[PDB]
């Protein structure tokens, strides 16, 4: 399918990383689609960080306000981007360690399957096997 997404950016040369991990969780809590950090270099020998937020266009006011309230930035910049998304569906698969949800993504003539992280990570911690072991066991089980 197709949709649109707002991208909000901010350059922070006077902001600590501690506060940035806080703002990333606030934004995700607020419903941002995605949030990420880009290492950038700014004037006067400043190692800096660019904060990027992807979100719903109707959420523009909320995520702007969070950024302006929680970080040191005086302004933000935003742009709308177009999107092309694959259609999702999930299969639950039985492994020696429990059920594992596999996300099957399709688009036109593409079909691919991603074992979900939280499932694999929870079971590996429960039976103390490596995360790759649960992952591989999920692939093996989705063979049928």
């Amino acid at each position: 399918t197709a949709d649109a997404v707002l991208m909000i950016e901010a350059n922070l040369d006077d902001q600590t990383g501690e506060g940035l991990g806080y703002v990333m969780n606030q934004l995700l809590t607020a419903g941002a689609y995605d949030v990420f950090f880009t290492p950038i270099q700014m004037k006067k020998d400043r190692p800096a960080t660019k904060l990027t937020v992807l979100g719903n266009v109707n959420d523009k006011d909320l995520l702007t306000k969070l950024i302006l309230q929680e970080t040191t930035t005086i302004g933000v910049r935003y742009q709308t981007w177009q999107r092309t998304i694959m259609q999702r569906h999930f299969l639950t698969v039985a492994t020696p360690y429990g059920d594992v949800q596999v996300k099957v993504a399709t688009y036109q003539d593409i079909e691919k399957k991603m074992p979900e992280y939280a499932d694999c990570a929870q079971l590996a911690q429960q039976f103390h096997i490596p995360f790759r072991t649960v992952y591989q066991a999920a692939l093996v089980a989705v063979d049928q």
Copy 2:
């Protein structure tokens, strides 16, 4: 308030950092709002740098020409972004080390205060105390 900003980008896989520090100062001298470096990885095992310039839209021709004249790039790409900016005002505050300008930023119902860097850095160098000491003394003094 609200405004618009042009963003100009360039990928440089055949450009030294020495020349890049020169171009960043030329652009800031020319009135760029902001200029930053993003580390990027390009084809044929090239560690590269993306040069981003933010500027006034009527300055598009100048900053383009600077980039094309001073760097190795054959083309630049540019886009206009929308902005949401907080309203600024400054308070000058008295510290045991001298006056320090505090930038108070407001937007709707947000109010935050940033001690200015050059003020704090100049006074710390003058009295050889750590930059954090002048910073904290500025916060303390803006308490009233």
Copy 3:
């Protein structure tokens, strides 16, 4: 001259670098103008990579499909950017090591010359001199 370019982006927190070097060569093989990697930091302590592709706007469907087929991403985002490009021409120059193609770039009143990489690299490997030696010999020879 002037033209427009599509920019396609994708954030990959569940993708290996091996597969990324493969997708970068597939995209360049498919006619992408440029492809690059940006190191980014995503949620849940994930060091991640942003994949950026620049391309012809009529190639949007191909490069999207490559990204969605070959990487783990569920969606891509794209935007059109405007371009300002210099006019190219090439001079072939004679060096003690052979002919070397120099790319001369002009725009309005700017004129700059870039010795081409593959030429210099091939000759340096053939006569085992440093790449800088062939480069400098090319500049010296384009003096006339």
Copy 4:
């Protein structure tokens, strides 16, 4: 004072960030002093990640086996570094938003105070004030 710390490194070009965020939690849980990710660029156009682990030098075997079991790497490299650490103790300080434990670090004639994050984050989420507001409120409060 003087002390030592083991540094373990591993270059991972075939490892997802998802798995990397997982192994970072395993390593801290395993008693690593610190763990961090450095973006690096490896052969064959691979965007990659360097994993660095700091720990007690007697933990070489523990943290070695953890890295070899949970990540994809064939080998790790390790070296001992000397350390100089400040003395810590904590003060509870009264702020307009509540008490905050401030961390006081000393070394010879150096003394600096860092308000603790979790306290500040705790008060900020409880009173819907910005994290920067409480942090600064603590700094000002720690003046006496």
Copy 5:
């Protein structure tokens, strides 16, 4: 087991990525165990690159002279690191797309299997299937 590897580093702020990709190929050709690029930020607003070379400690002179001849740097620094490497051997495994050599690495009681990239890339380009498809097909196949 236990072993040692020489690490050579050099900070390059006046070196293009083009030349860096070239020297990376020279170094691997010269018998370096590994080579990678780290983005770093140096004085005077310079976006720069750290070159790290791993090699046999008896190669100090070879790889030193290579770095000093082919790059722009005035000096390099080097240190010996200890290593812990897993035992490798290769299995050919039958997949729906063909045979794939899988790399089996062992250390004490740890055993993990990584399908090889070039085989997977070879089958993927031949049958126009995604690299992730063959890799997963190998993982599932290597279960027995």
Copy 6:
């Protein structure tokens, strides 16, 4: 030749780039051989910076105390590295834009010449020509 250099490192997740650019100027002023910033990713979703300082090994105390006084870090780690440095001397060379001091570096049978930046930058700003133009003009001029 052979020599040694002290390397001091510190991981800073609660430190602004503003303060980092400041401490970089303090460190160079304090006689550090070199200082650079590496973007790193630390626990709890923190975009962070690694500070590396190179110096004389007898400066351990000077540069240690500087880092502990001016930055936020609780500890630093340090190690001695061996060095191999080329011999420098400077030539003044005649270019169409003026005389430029070129730096000639030697080691055994290796000889390379790097025109100096500040001279090139000086002539470029004076005659409004590109820095790449003067640099290349120097390279060509240094052929004899």
